[PDB]
Design brief:
Blueprint: E1 6-8, E2 16-18, E3 20-22, H1 30-33, E4 34-36, E5 40-47, E6 56-61, E7 64-70, E8 75-82, E9 86-96, E10 99-102, E11 106-111, E12 139-145, E13 166-172, H2 186-195, H3 209-214, H4 230-241, E14 246-252, H5 266-282, E15 288-292, H6 311-333, E16 338-344, H7 347-350, H8 355-359, E17 364-368, H9 416-426, E18 433-438, E19 440-445, E20 465-466, E21 480-482, H10 483-491, E22 501-506, E23 511-516, E24 521-524, H11 528-541, E25 545-549, H12 557-565
Parallel strand pairs: 2-11, 12-13, 12-25, 13-14, 14-15, 15-16, 16-17, 17-18, 18-25
Antiparallel strand pairs: 1-5, 3-4, 5-8, 6-7, 6-9, 9-10, 9-11, 19-20, 19-21, 19-24, 22-23, 23-24
Helix pairs in contact: 5-6, 11-12
Bound molecules: the ligand S=C=Nc1ccc2oc(C3=NCCN3)cc2c1 (2 copies).
Family: Belongs to the glycosyl hydrolase 18 family. Chitinase class II subfamily.
Protein name: chitinase
Catalytic activity: Random endo-hydrolysis of N-acetyl-beta-D-glucosaminide (1->4)-beta-linkages in chitin and chitodextrins
Length: about 575
Amino acid sequence: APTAPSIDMYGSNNLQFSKIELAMETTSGYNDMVKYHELAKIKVKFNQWSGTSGDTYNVYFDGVKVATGAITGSQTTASFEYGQGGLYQMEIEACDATGCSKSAPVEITIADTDGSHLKPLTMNVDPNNKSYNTDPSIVMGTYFVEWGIYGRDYTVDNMPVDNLTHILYGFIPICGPNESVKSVGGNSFNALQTACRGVNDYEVVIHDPWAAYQKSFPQAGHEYSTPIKGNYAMLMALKQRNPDLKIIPSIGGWTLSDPFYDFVDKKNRDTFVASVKKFLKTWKFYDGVDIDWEFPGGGGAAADKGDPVNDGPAYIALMRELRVMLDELEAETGRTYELTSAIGVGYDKIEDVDYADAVQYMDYIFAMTYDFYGGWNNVPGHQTALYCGSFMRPGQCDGGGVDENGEPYKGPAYTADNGIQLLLAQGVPANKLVLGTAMYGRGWEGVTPDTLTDPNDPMTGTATGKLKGSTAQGVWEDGVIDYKGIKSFMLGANNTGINGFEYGYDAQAEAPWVWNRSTGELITFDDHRSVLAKGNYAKSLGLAGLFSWEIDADNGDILNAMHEGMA
Ligand SMILES: S=C=Nc1ccc2oc(C3=NCCN3)cc2c1
Ligand SMILES: S=C=Nc1ccc2oc(C3=NCCN3)cc2c1
């Protein structure tokens, strides 16, 4: 009949323990900040200040004895190891010759990176996002960007998760040559250089540990002693709410592609593949890997990079090696892992890889059917059009014509259909292709009525520079504006144009635009109409479905249209 133990919370780290040890107050190399243990160390302090303390204690989780040891006077520390993540009701019993006595139960948290210790996330979704009964075999994907939590103020609990089958999390960098990241800013390059200290070149790391697992999100119940926080803890809780959702890390993108060019050497591919396997064993909520190399053959952010002879065979070899590694994981865990890639769809990008060969290893190809035209130059055009628009010259659609200076075109025009047709012509199966939608516009200023060669079509005009505006209007970088900013400040509630803009739509291209004839501002984007057209196209060709880039920029209209388009 010893006295029942009483739990010392503060000395028991508030009963928060974890299989993964994460630095919370400092920033260093990835292998200094993140250490995954097969067993969590549990240390619970209890006291017995009254009566007799007894000789031995037992610790129970949900009524099952998990530890035992000696009672040490009026305060005792039970230290033991535990391998299974979860939330458990713990009791501590003190025993002697004359009987045993149990503490009142208390919840203990043993964190693991599948979210097994988390309750389902509470969502805060804009109610403009509607509910649909889309066939569950259709891909409905979007990219969520790690940095959406700063200015854009868009967190995981804001995502319309019931309307998504795949969440691609952007972007995981590869250690090594990454000068392109300095175009984003020196802090972002410095963050990568910090993460890579003590890490071999060609291994993956987390670019922004603050956003990924350190930041406390009060909306997710996070507190000081919460063992995993950040977007990653939210994605874990999201998987608990939506256990069929696939969450896939996307490696690469525009500014993080420079190390992929070194994958012509197999040793570098080996290093990378092993590192991905270790990342997925560490962060168990992820369901696969998405390779976003921009672009094999060159044409990406680094003008000096690209080997059109060797990059495509390296890309195929990489996908083969990834699929072998992921089959090893499947065997170890009993889970299914998906292998996917986002690829350029200009004819010059498609010609540099045999995707029919690479795609036999892949579940899905995400065709980047956007960014065809944009503020990097002063040539307006439809950035995400399905077909050739009205502005194109004779012979431009197919590539056999000359431009307005007399220079021959070198290939078929940039349109989503020209890209899809080229990939199907290679032998890529329709049912592995996912068509992309932009949730943003690209834009110019100075396209005035006197620059147009066809007065009904501002895409035949000439710009003087990139669209400018404030972050309040959804302009986070010159030349680019969020769809929700176009809707609020350029379309208005009737979709006919406000603030001096008029809405236009190229019914042949299937591409909308807004134009302010006073300022020459012209923006090319995707809207309800063009997305319904993309969905109709995807249905008619037996494509796998649709994905969008990037979800924080939508107000619900684009994802709703994607569902309606596939109905
Ligand atoms: S493309 C690229 N887009 C990016 C990439 C990284 C970024 O970091 C921030 C940021 N600003 C203050 C704290 N963090 C914005 C931002 C935009
Ligand atoms: S994140 C990303 N942002 C992007 C995504 C695609 C892009 O393409 C260009 C471009 N520059 C010259 C020809 N094309 C810039 C650029 C930035």
